[PDB]
């Protein structure tokens, strides 16, 4: 319902081009200083060596997803894969692997490691463990069902960025209510309860183990629709 054509001195659309830097607009024209224009104009980018480097560096084509159904590798001989983390698990592993370098790197590079500890201790206790450390502790990276032992083989992350798989009794599994585990883990569920589905959390009753699955995790129907898992 614009009436811009009626008046001549009215602001034109061509004038409103500096607002593209803050307001997202569909492409109307590519700038001379645009990165795409720079790439498509310089004959240096037309060399075969640059194209070969572009095709043979960065992310590889093999790891890119190609199907709506995927099958990970087999942990054991007779187990059945059920659930697997896709991106959240990788990011958690990368975050836990930061301590594999930063902790030694700071130890060899900080003049006051005592000050670093006196700072980070409350950060872990009050801000970090309830955010990342305990979330990764309760994170279930991969979960399969071993039929021979009628158990669940679950591989999860460990503090220094490690992987560890354990077998837990299926009869020890109980459905954990979010309301039943709300208040006692309030800050844990408040700051970092976003990545896991509070409507689906399990518990191994043998050692009081809490198993949490990512809200974006990949679940296999064949494993879910098994006699072991009802």
């Amino acid at each position: 319902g614009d009436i811009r054509h009626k008046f001549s001195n009215e602001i034109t659309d061509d004038d409103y081009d500096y607002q593209r830097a803050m307001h997202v607009k569909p492409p109307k024209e590519e700038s001379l200083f645009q990165l795409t224009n720079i790439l498509s104009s310089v004959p240096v980018f037309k060399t075969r060596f640059f194209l070969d480097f572009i095709a043979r560096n960065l992310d590889t084509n093999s790891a890119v997803s190609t199907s709506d159904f995927v099958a990970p590798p087999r942990v054991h001989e007779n187990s059945f894969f059920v659930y697997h983390s896709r991106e959240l698990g990788n990011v958690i592993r990368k975050y836990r692997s930061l301590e594999s370098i930063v902790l030694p790197g700071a130890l060899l590079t900080f003049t006051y490691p005592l000050f670093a500890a006196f700072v980070a201790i409350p950060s872990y206790y009050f801000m970090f463990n309830a955010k990342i450390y305990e979330m990764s502790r309760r994170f279930v990276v991969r979960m399969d069902v071993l039929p021979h032992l009628e158990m669940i083989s679950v591989q999860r992350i460990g503090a220094f960025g490690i992987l560890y798989t354990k077998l837990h009794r299926i009869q020890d599994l109980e459905y954990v209510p979010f309301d039943q585990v709300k208040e006692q883990e309030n800050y844990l569920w408040a700051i970092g309860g976003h990545g896991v589905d509070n409507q689906l959390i399990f518990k191994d009753r043998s050692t009081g183990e809490f198993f949490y699955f990512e809200r974006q995790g990949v679940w296999d129907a064949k494993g879910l629709n098994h006699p072991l898992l009802n």
């Binding site: 498509s40 095709a55 709506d68």
Partner: protein, 167 residues
């Protein structure tokens, strides 16, 4: 809501419903052979940089097949590494707009090339990745108008309108 994985197959006679006109070739070498496709790929290098460095899950679709027998999409997109074929559940693909696709990346992307049809973003929620076709492309009118691709068979209000939201 739930990411339940179910095995699918191919109809073995999938209908080719869309093929990029400019990006015609066997793969990366064929695109390098064509000068115009080479310039398009040079422009799409910013798309590759956005996907890799800026962590933007997205694909530049250059061809497509449809397997209504298996209810699957058999797209064939192009990237800095070459041509990649993607099989997608027909229930896992939804429409999306240019503003939504752009704002899906928290970091600011580079200047867009003109070879992208901004109004036809396609999000694979199961893979959670956006896809943009080529502006210069040929779309099969009969292939798109098959009874399987009807909005009555595909368009669900909850998935279409509220599944992908950024706050």
């Amino acid at each position: 809501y739930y990411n339940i994985m179910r095995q699918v197959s191919l109809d073995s006679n999938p209908i080719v419903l869309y093929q990029s006109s400019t990006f015609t070739g066997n793969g990366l070498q064929e695109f390098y052979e064509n000068a115009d496709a080479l310039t398009k790929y040079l422009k799409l290098v910013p798309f590759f940089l956005e996907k890799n460095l800026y962590d933007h899950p997205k694909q530049f679709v250059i061809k497509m097949e449809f397997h209504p027998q298996n209810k699957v999409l058999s797209l064939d997109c192009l990237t800095h590494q070459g041509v990649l074929k993607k099989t997608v559940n027909l229930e896992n693909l939804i429409p999306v707009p240019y503003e939504d696709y752009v704002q899906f990346c928290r970091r600011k992307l580079f200047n867009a090339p003109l070879f992208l049809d901004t109004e036809m973003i396609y999000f694979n929620t199961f893979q959670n990745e956006f896809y943009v076709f080529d502006k210069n492309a040929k779309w099969n009118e009969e292939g798109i108008n098959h009874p399987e691709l009807d909005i009555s068979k595909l368009y669900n209000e909850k998935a279409w309108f509220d599944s992908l939201r950024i706050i």
